[PDB]
C-alpha cells in the first residue's frame, strides 16, 4: 500500500517513508529523519514527559531527548537522563 501525506498533497510508495528525502510538504513522510525542514521527531522519553523536537535536530550530534533516541547515527552517544 502507498503512503499519503497527512495534509493531502501527494501519494508516495511506502519505501519513500523515512528514506532520508523530504517528499511531503508537511514533512509527514520523514518522522524519524532530518530530511524535512518542517518535520518533527517524537521522543517517547519513558520515565519523564514525552517531547517533540524539530526534524533538524535528529542526528545533529546534540542530545535533545532525555532518552537519547534522537541521536542514533551521529557519533554522539547520549545516555538516558529521564530519571
Amino acid at each position: 500500500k502507498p503512503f499519503t501525506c497527512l495534509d493531502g498533497t501527494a501519494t508516495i510508495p511506502f519505501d519513500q517513508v523515512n528514506d532520508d528525502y523530504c517528499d511531503c510538504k508537511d514533512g509527514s513522510d520523514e518522522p524519524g529523519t532530518a530530511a524535512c525542514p518542517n518535520g518533527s521527531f517524537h521522543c517517547t522519553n519513558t520515565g519523564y514527559k514525552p517531547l517533540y523536537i524539530l526534524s533538524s535536530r535528529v542526528n545533529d550530534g546534540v542530545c535533545d531527548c532525555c532518552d537519547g533516541t534522537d541521536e542514533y547515527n551521529s557519533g554522539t552517544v547520549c545516555e538516558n537522563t529521564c530519571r
Partner: protein, 850 residues
C-alpha cells in the same frame, strides 16, 4: 572634534614632502656606476644640489613584476626594511641591456615582452610591454629622499624627540590610460578612490578614531599600502612596502592618474604588478604576501557578540535563546568585561568562575566561544603576565631604557614589543591550555586595540620615539605592530593544539600579509543607514588587496538601530564574509529574538540563507586560499570592460556566481539592480525568474527581501538542512543549484574537508569536485585527484533553472547499475528538480536528461 589627529600640514614630514610640487627632478642616475648583478641592476643616483648619493636596486621578477628599491649609498645609520611581510624571497628574472644612448639604458626582462627604460637625467623609469608604456616612475619629479643627517616636534601636548631628524622618502607614479584606482584601506570612503588635489591625501597610519565619520580620508585602524588601477584595457597594481606613516596623493590629468607615496622613514621599496588582468594582479600580489588563511568552517557562520555578556549564566541563556527561537549561531563572544579588571588571559572570579564548564556546555551544543585578548598589559605586580614580561625585558621601551607605560582599559598599561620574535614566541606559548587557564579547544581569540591604542598617547597611539627590538623607533614599525599581534595569537592557537587545529583570530589593526592570520572588521561603526551602506565599499577595498575575511558590526556598534535597520543589516551581513553582530556597552540588548515577530522572521530567514550557502562560502575561501582570488568582489572584477560598473558600490558579487544588492534604505519599495553581461542571464533565486543582461532591473522588495541573483553558467552547492550550528551540518547531503547559460551549460566547484584541521594540507585529506553541465548531462569529476576524504556527504537533490521537461532522467555512477530518478518540473519557472540522486559526493557520476 578632530583636533586630536594630524592633517598633512600638521605632520611635519608630510608638510615638507607635499610642498615639493611637480617639476624638474634634481635626481640623476650615474650610468658609469651601472652594474648588472645576478639578481638585480644597481646604479648610483645623486641629488644634483646636495650631492647626496643613493643606490637604486632594480629587479625584474618572475610572474611579471618589477621591484624598485632605493637606499643611501653610505648611510650614517641603517634604514628600516619591512620584515616578515613577504612570504618568500621573490624569484627574480634576468635583466639585459637591450638599448642605450647618452641619457638612457633600455632593459629587457628575461626575453620579453617587458622592458624598463632608465633615463639618466633627470632620473626616471618607464615600464613597457613591447612598445606600450605601462607606467612611469618619477615622471613628475616628486622623488624625495631625506638622508640621515648628523627634528624635535611637538603636537598637542606630546613631544617627539625625533633623534634622527628628517628621514622621509617619497616617489610618484604615472598610470597612462587609468582613470580608476582602488585599495589602500582602511578608510571610511568610497570604493573608487577620489583625487586628493583639493584636500587631504589618503593617510595610512593605524589609528583608533572614536566615532569615525563617513566620506573622509582619515586613517583608520588598518593600513594596506596596495593600490589597484583598472581600465577597459588593463589592470596594474602598486605595492608600497613601507611600515611607517604614509600619505598617498592621487591626481588625474590621454586620461591619466598619478599616485604619490610619502613615508616618514624606511627605504623606498615598491612592487609593480603588471597584470594584464586583475586576476593576474591578484596572483602577483599573493605570491608576495601570501593568501587568505583557510578559515575553520565554524568561523564562516553567525557570530553573536556584544559589550558585554554578563556572566556564564547570560552566555548560556543566549545559547539557549537561539535554539528556543530556531535561529542558527556558531559562536558567542566574550568582550573585555569577562576578564579580571581587563587583565587579559584571566576570568572575573565572580561572573566567570568556571570557564571550563561554560565551554563544555557550549561544546555540548556544538558551538564555540571567542574571548578578547588585547596587547596592552596592566601594570600590576600581582599580574603574572606583567611580571613575566617585565622580568624578561620584553616590553616596548623609551629612550631612557625604562619600559613604556601608557593608559588603556585597565588604567596604566605597558605594551609588549611584538616586533621582537622572542616576545611573539612567549605570547604564542601563553595560549597553551596549561598557561591560559580556563581555555579549551572551542575557545578562540579576538585581538583588539592593537594599533596599538594608547588613550593618553599622541593621536591615541604610541609615541614615535619609543624603542623596539634592534633599536628601531616606533615610527619605523608602526603599521606592522598589529599584524605581529595577529600573527603571534594565531600561531598560539595552532601550537596549543600540537599543530593540528586551524586558528580563528579577529584583528582590528592590520597590514599587508594580515590575510595569512585570520579575519578583520571595520571597527566601531554606528547604527545608521549610511554606515550600513558603507560596509560594502570598505570590505570591497579590503578584498581587492587580499583581505577576504572582512565584515562590519551587524546593527552598528554605537547607538540603537531601529528594528527595520537591524533587519536590513542582518540581510547585508548574511552575504558578507565575516558575519558578526556586536554592540556598545550602553546599547539596548538586540539578540535577534528580542524583536517583534515580523522582524524576527526576516532575520531568521537571512540566517538560514547564510547557513545553507556555507558549502559555497567554504569553496570560495578555499579558492582564495589556493589562488589569492577575493571572495567578495566588485562588479568590475567580473566585467572589466563594462565601464558603468567601475564605481558601483551598492552591489557586489560572491565569486562569479552570485550578485547581491541588499536593501539599504528605510521604507524602500524597490531597488535598482544592475545586471551586467552581454549574452548573460541572471536568475532571481527567490522567484527563479530569468533576466537578460545588460539591464537595470527595478525589483520591488518587502521587509524579508534580499535581492540575490545567480549567474547563468554557474553551479552553487547548498546545505538545504539548516541546523543549529555548522558543526551539526558538516556531514549533511548537498543540493546543487544549476543555472543554465543561454548555451545550456554550467560549471562549479565544491571543497570539503574535516572543517577545522590542517589535514587537507599535511595529509591531502579533502575533496575538490568539479560539476559540469553541457548538452543534457550533469557530470561530477575530481578537480584535484590528490585529495581523498572519508565522508558520508551525498547528493540529495539537483535544482536546474532554465531547463525544459525531460522524458526521463538517468544516473550513472562508477560501481553502480544505471538507475532512473524521479523529477518534478514547473513550466512557469522552467525549474527542474531531480529527486534524491543518492550518490556519494566522493564518487564520479553523471546524470542524463533524455
Amino acid at each position: 572634534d578632530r583636533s586630536n589627529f594630524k592633517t598633512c600640514d600638521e605632520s611635519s614630514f608630510c608638510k615638507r614632502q607635499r610642498s615639493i610640487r611637480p617639476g624638474l627632478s634634481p635626481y640623476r642616475a650615474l650610468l658609469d656606476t651601472l652594474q648588472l648583478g645576478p639578481d638585480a641592476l644597481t646604479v648610483h643616483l645623486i641629488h644634483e644640489v646636495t650631492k647626496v648619493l643613493l643606490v637604486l636596486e632594480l629587479q625584474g621578477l618572475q610572474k611579471d613584476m618589477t621591484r624598485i628599491r632605493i637606499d643611501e649609498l653610505e648611510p650614517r645609520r641603517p634604514r628600516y626594511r619591512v620584515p616578515d611581510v613577504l612570504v618568500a624571497d621573490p624569484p627574480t628574472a634576468r635583466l639585459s641591456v637591450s638599448g642605450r644612448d647618452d641619457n638612457s639604458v633600455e632593459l629587457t626582462v628575461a626575453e620579453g615582452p617587458y622592458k624598463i627604460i632608465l633615463t639618466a637625467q633627470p632620473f626616471r623609469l618607464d615600464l613597457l610591454e613591447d612598445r606600450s608604456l605601462l607606467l612611469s616612475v618619477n615622471a613628475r619629479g616628486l622623488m624625495a629622499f631625506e638622508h640621515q643627517r648628523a627634528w624635535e616636534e611637538t603636537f598637542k601636548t606630546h613631544s617627539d624627540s625625533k633623534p634622527y631628524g628628517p628621514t622621509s622618502v617619497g616617489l610618484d607614479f604615472s598610470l597612462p590610460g587609468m582613470e580608476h584606482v582602488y585599495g589602500i584601506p582602511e578608510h571610511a570612503d568610497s570604493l573608487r578612490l577620489k583625487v586628493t588635489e583639493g584636500g587631504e591625501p589618503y593617510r595610512l597610519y593605524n589609528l583608533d578614531v572614536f566615532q569615525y565619520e563617513l566620506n573622509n580620508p582619515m586613517a583608520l585602524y588598518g593600513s594596506v599600502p596596495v593600490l589597484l588601477a583598472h581600465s577597459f584595457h588593463r589592470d596594474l597594481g602598486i605595492f608600497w612596502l613601507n611600515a611607517a606613516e604614509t600619505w598617498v596623493d592621487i591626481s588625474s590629468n590621454t586620461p591619466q592618474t598619478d599616485i604619490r607615496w610619502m613615508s616618514e622613514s624606511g627605504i623606498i621599496d615598491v612592487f609593480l604588478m603588471l597584470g594584464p588582468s586583475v586576476f593576474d594582479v591578484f596572483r602577483q600580489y599573493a605570491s608576495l604576501t601570501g593568501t587568505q588563511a583557510l578559515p575553520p568552517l565554524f568561523s564562516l557562520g553567525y557570530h553573536q557578540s556584544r559589550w558585554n555578556y554578563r556572566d556564564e549564566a547570560d552566555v548560556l541563556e543566549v545559547d539557549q535563546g537561539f535554539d528556543d527561537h530556531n535561529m542558527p549561531c556558531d559562536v558567542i563572544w566574550l568582550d573585555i568585561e569577562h576578564a579580571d579588571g581587563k587583565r587579559y588571559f584571566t576570568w572575573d572570579p565572580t561572573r566567570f568562575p568556571q570557564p571550563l564548564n561554560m565551554l563544555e556546555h557550549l561544546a555540548s551544543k556544538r558551538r564555540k566561544l571567542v574571548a578578547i585578548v588585547d596587547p596592552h598589559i596592566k601594570v600590576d605586580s600581582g599580574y603574572r603576565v606583567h611580571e613575566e614580561l617585565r622580568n624578561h625585558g620584553l616590553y616596548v621601551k623609551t629612550r631612557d631604557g625604562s619600559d613604556y607605560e601608557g593608559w588603556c582599559w585597565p588604567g596604566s598599561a605597558s605594551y609588549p614589543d611584538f616586533t621582537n620574535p622572542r616576545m611573539r614566541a612567549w605570547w604564542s606559548n601563553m595560549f597553551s591550555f596549561d598557561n591560559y587557564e580556563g581555555s579549551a579547544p572551542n575557545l578562540y581569540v579576538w585581538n583588539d586595540m592593537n594599533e596599538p591604542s594608547v588613550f593618553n598617547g599622541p593621536e591615541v597611539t604610541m609615541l614615535k620615539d619609543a624603542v623596539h627590538y634592534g633599536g628601531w623607533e616606533h615610527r619605523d614599525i608602526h603599521n606592522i605592530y598589529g599584524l605581529y599581534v595577529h600573527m603571534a595569537t594565531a600561531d598560539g592557537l595552532i601550537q596549543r593544539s600540537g599543530g593540528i587545529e586551524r586558528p580563528f583570530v579577529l584583528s582590528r589593526a592590520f597590514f599587508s600579509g594580515s590575510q595569512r592570520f585570520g579575519a578583520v572588521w571595520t571597527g566601531d561603526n554606528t547604527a545608521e543607514w549610511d554606515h550600513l551602506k558603507i560596509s560594502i565599499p570598505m570590505c570591497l577595498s579590503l578584498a581587492l588587496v587580499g583581505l577576504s575575511f572582512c565584515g562590519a558590526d551587524v546593527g552598528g556598534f554605537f547607538k540603537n538601530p531601529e528594528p527595520e535597520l537591524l533587519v536590513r543589516w542582518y540581510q547585508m551581513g548574511a552575504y558578507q564574509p565575516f558575519f558578526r553582530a556586536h554592540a556598545h556597552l550602553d546599547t539596548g540588548r538586540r539578540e535577534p529574538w528580542l524583536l517583534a515577530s515580523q522582524y524576527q522572521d526576516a532575520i531568521r530567514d537571512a540566517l538560514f540563507q547564510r547557513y545553507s550557502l556555507l558549502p559555497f562560502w567554504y569553496t570560495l575561501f578555499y579558492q582564495a586560499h589556493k589562488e589569492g582570488f577575493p571572495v567578495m568582489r566588485p562588479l568590475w572584477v567580473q566585467y572589466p570592460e563594462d565601464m558603468s560598473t567601475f564605481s558601483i558600490e551598492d552591489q557586489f558579487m560572491l565569486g562569479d556566481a552570485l550578485l547581491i544588492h541588499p536593501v539599504s534604505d528605510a521604507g524602500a519599495h524597490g531597488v535598482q539592480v544592475y545586471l551586467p553581461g552581454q549574452e548573460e542571464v541572471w536568475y532571481d533565486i527567490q522567484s527563479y525568474q530569468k533576466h537578460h543582461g545588460p539591464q537595470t532591473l527595478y525589483l520591488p522588495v518587502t521587509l524579508s527581501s534580499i535581492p540575490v541573483f545567480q549567474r547563468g553558467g554557474t553551479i552553487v552547492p547548498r546545505w538545504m538542512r539548516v541546523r543549529r550550528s555548522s558543526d551539526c551540518m558538516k556531514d549533511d547531503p548537498i543540493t546543487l543549484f544549476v543555472a543554465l547559460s543561454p548555451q545550456g551549460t554550467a560549471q562549479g566547484e565544491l571543497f570539503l574537508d574535516d572543517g577545522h584541521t590542517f589535514n587537507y594540507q599535511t595529509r591531502h585529506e579533502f575533496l575538490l569536485r568539479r560539476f559540469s553541465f553541457s548538452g543534457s548531462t550533469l557530470v561530477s569529476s575530481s578537480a584535484d585527484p590528490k585529495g581523498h576524504l572519508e565522508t558520508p556527504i551525498w547528493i540529495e537533490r539537483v535544482v536546474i533553472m532554465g531547463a525544459g521537461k525531460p522524458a526521463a532522467v538517468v544516473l550513472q555512477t562508477k560501481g553502480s547499475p544505471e538507475s532512473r530518478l524521479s523529477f518534478q518540473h514547473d513550466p512557469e519557472t522552467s525549474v527542474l528538480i531531480l529527486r534524491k540522486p543518492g550518490v556519494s559526493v566522493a564518487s564520479d557520476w553523471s546524470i542524463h536528461l533524455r
